Design a protein around this ligand. Structure first.
Ligand SMILES: COc1c(O)cc(O)c2c1O[C@H](c1ccccc1)CC2=O
Ligand SMILES: COc1c(O)cc(O)c2c1O[C@H](c1ccccc1)CC2=O
Ligand SMILES: N[C@@H](CCC(=O)N[C@@H](CS)C(=O)NCC(=O)O)C(=O)O
Ligand SMILES: N[C@@H](CCC(=O)N[C@@H](CS)C(=O)NCC(=O)O)C(=O)O
Ligand SMILES: [Ca+2]
Lengths: 241, 241
């Protein structure tokens, strides 16, 4: 019964994770957009002292999101939110019930967070070399069930954790967004269209086909425009190695 | 009934996390040391293709750990293992039952992984300035309940995840092990003994006082000697400014 408010921003793949899980849960929830990178509201540290999107409040009296209550629980970190939503909505089966299959979900999230995410950040924001990103993506693809299906077989929060990033990669590459070189952009576009990455392309299509993605995605062009508002995506800057 | 084999190394805080959780669960399990950093066995990629410790096998026929079975489940990534052990031993209450308290546990793990561990890596392996690490530790300390207790109140896997690192910090600093200068070593030692960090000292005492720590710790001096075998800690080497 307790209220859920998710503080969001369209560009943010971390916020996108949580919107997907809340859709899959069938939750009733409120979203509130926050201009976190250019004009953070003075009240925002009340909902997340770390000053990062997403932020979540849970319970407390029903209040406008820009008037957060001291009584609501303040939940930070997107992966913690994903597990929280699975705990709140057990009948939605956002995780498997078998312990080994649940571990596949948790391992997939850790592989992404520990080996892939930092490579996306460094290639796009620092223009570091793309080969280590492609290697990490090939590793992650190797963890998928080979024949089809999601990270743990049935859909789970592991797929909510990963699709925001994989789904942004393709249109960001096509629009030329990111500080990497022309040469590395060509390399990544050819690699991600190559037979080497057929399995992860099917994974992206399968995740994108679900209503939880369609209803939380602004469209490729619109997401590209939101990403262009991010200060660390400095237009006209590229790094070369 | 299904066997658990943890591939371990004394120096490894990541392996230590999982030993602590297995002890708290009252599990039956085997540990098998692996010289992962200097002489990895040719069979080790069969249990973990990432070639990292810890690695875990689950189920399958009982076999010597250096002859792993293709029938066992191969589980990678320490935090996935911690969640797996909680799933396997629900009567051990390795997580809270209440969703909000469980979220405090997951959030504390994510704060450590996302903001603290990388600062430990920078300071100890690169000798970068200590101030950002102390700031990250103050943030993590601020997430603890101020009046006492563990991360989520009662002990949970969140405390298994974090104590291996905090417990190594003090004796490593006493030994001067790591690429930071004497000047920053003194600065860290003074800071961690100061009133600023009284709450995290209480936390380290409370975690270390549990049998799960005593039974999985070689002793301060012995743990320092194991850490000196780690190539990336470059015993005898320090960077300055
Ligand atoms: C501002 O957008 C973000 C963000 O808020 C947080 C991030 O870590 C990233 C990011 O854009 C880049 C990107 C590349 C490819 C796929 C998804 C995202 C790099 C990245 O890693
Ligand atoms: C070699 O041991 C390891 C390791 O296997 C993985 C690590 O991330 C670290 C580490 O030693 C350093 C260290 C500092 C303070 C406390 C625990 C550990 C830095 C660190 O971050
Ligand atoms: N690990 C966090 C990361 C959240 C994050 O970095 N959010 C960015 C927007 S995509 C932000 O809000 N602020 C950037 C900053 O100040 O660190 C999570 O998983 O929720
Ligand atoms: N995220 C992994 C980290 C595991 C890890 O990095 N282990 C180190 C020992 S502490 C290793 O075995 N190898 C480091 C390397 O591959 O060079 C976990 O949580 O289990
Ligand atoms: Ca595979």
């Amino acid at each position: 019964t307790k209220q859920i408010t998710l503080y969001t921003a369209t560009f943010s793949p971390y916020a996108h994770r949580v919107r997907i899980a809340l859709e899959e849960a069938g939750a009733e929830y409120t979203t509130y957009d926050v201009d976190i990178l250019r004009n953070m509201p003075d009240w925002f540290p009340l909902v997340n002292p770390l000053k990062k999107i997403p932020a979540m409040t849970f319970g407390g009296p029903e209040v406008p999101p820009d008037q957060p209550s001291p009584e609501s629980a303040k939940i930070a970190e997107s992966l913690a939110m994903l597990e929280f939503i699975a705990d709140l909505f057990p009948d939605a089966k956002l995780l498997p019930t078998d312990p080994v299959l649940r571990a596949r979900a948790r391992t997939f999230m850790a592989l992404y967070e520990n080996y892939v995410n930092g490579q996306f950040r460094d290639v796009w924001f620092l223009g570091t070399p793309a080969d280590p990103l492609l290697q990490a993506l090939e590793m992650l693809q190797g963890a998928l069930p080979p024949d089809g299906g999601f990270a743990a077989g049935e859909w789970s929060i592991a797929d909510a954790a990963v699709i925001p990033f994989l789904a942004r990669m393709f249109p960001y590459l096509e629009a030329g967004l990111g500080l990497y070189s022309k040469e590395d952009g060509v390399k990544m576009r050819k690699a991600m269209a190559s037979e080497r990455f057929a399995r992860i392309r099917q994974y992206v299509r399968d995740c994108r086909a679900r209503p939880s993605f369609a209803n939380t995605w602004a469209g490729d062009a619109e997401q590209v425009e939101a990403a262009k508002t991010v200060p660390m995506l400095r237009v006209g800057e590229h790094h070369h190695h």
